[PDB]
């Protein structure tokens, strides 16, 4: 009943706050200056980037930014894997299907959660102690200049739904438990879990935003936008693998991107 769905929503929220260091709660605090915390170092050009290296974690800038983005993604994939393992019934699935769900889900979730850290002007980095500007990321020489702009475009739309962490915790679980991912062995137990998560998400959206209406319906249209940004992103990564020499792709990302869209 309504109770079991409230319980799932609360378990997921607890597991989400645990799994991910920087929540949407904090990130907006930082972006609106509505905290007491020390404001983040702004990276708006080549000079500010160089002077920035004090606050962040490890030849040309476009390649150095890209390799930094790589290390954060890997950490993101690890955080999401821990969160997946908390989704009731997920670990009881066929391990090959666990791998398949992560393999296709993790970037849809990275992009979902990146939006929590973005506005139309830029993105919080290194757990909110940096703020890289959108203009700066566009300015980068191609193909690296086109890398982040689609994520910014998705983000301005997605942030309009004004979801909080408690809503996102279930939405993320629903994305992970997608029964239509290529190469799944046993769709049924996945669709069974996703059905419970979608009911939990629908209830959660009625209770947490009752002055809103079919926040639920609009939010489900965006799961398709997320597959497009992923497809589009895999293509730009395909280009970069070819057109660049002094850059290699972190092995965990090679596992994920190899034989994908």
């Amino acid at each position: 009943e309504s109770a079991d769905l409230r319980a799932l929503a609360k378990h997921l929220y607890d597991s989400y706050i645990k799994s991910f260091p920087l929540t949407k709660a904090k990130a907006r605090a930082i972006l609106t200056g509505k905290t007491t915390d020390k404001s983040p170092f702004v990276i708006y050009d080549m000079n500010s980037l160089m002077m920035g290296e004090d606050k962040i974690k490890f030849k040309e800038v476009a390649i150095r930014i890209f390799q930094g983005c790589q290390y954060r993604s890997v950490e993101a994939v690890q955080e999401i894997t821990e969160y997946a393992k908390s989704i009731p019934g997920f670990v009881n699935l066929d391990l090959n299907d666990q791998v398949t769900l992560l393999k296709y889900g993790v970037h849809e979730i990275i992009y979902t959660m990146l939006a929590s850290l973005m506005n139309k002007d830029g993105v919080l980095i290194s757990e909110g102690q940096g703020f890289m500007t959108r203009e700066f990321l566009k300015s980068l020489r191609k193909p690296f200049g086109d890398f982040m702009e689609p994520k910014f475009e998705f983000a301005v739309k997605f942030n309009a739904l004004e979801l909080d962490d408690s809503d996102l915790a279930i939405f993320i679980a629903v994305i992970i438990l997608s029964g239509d991912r290529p190469g799944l062995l046993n769709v049924k137990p996945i669709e069974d879990i996703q059905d419970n998560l979608l009911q939990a998400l629908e209830l959660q959206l009625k209770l947490n935003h009752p002055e809103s209406s079919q926040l639920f319906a609009k939010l489900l249209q965006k799961m398709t936008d997320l597959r497009q940004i992923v497809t589009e992103h895999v293509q730009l990564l395909q280009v970069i693998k070819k057109t660049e020499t002094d850059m290699s792709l972190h092995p965990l990302l090679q596992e994920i991107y190899k034989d994908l869209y």
Binding site: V77, Q78, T81, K85, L95, Q98, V99, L102, K103, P251, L252, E255, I256, K258
Partner: peptide, 11 residues
């Protein structure tokens, strides 16, 4: 294949 994802999942 998917050694790391396997590792991350079993850890």
């Amino acid at each position: 294949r998917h050694k790391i994802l396997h590792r991350l999942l079993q850890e």
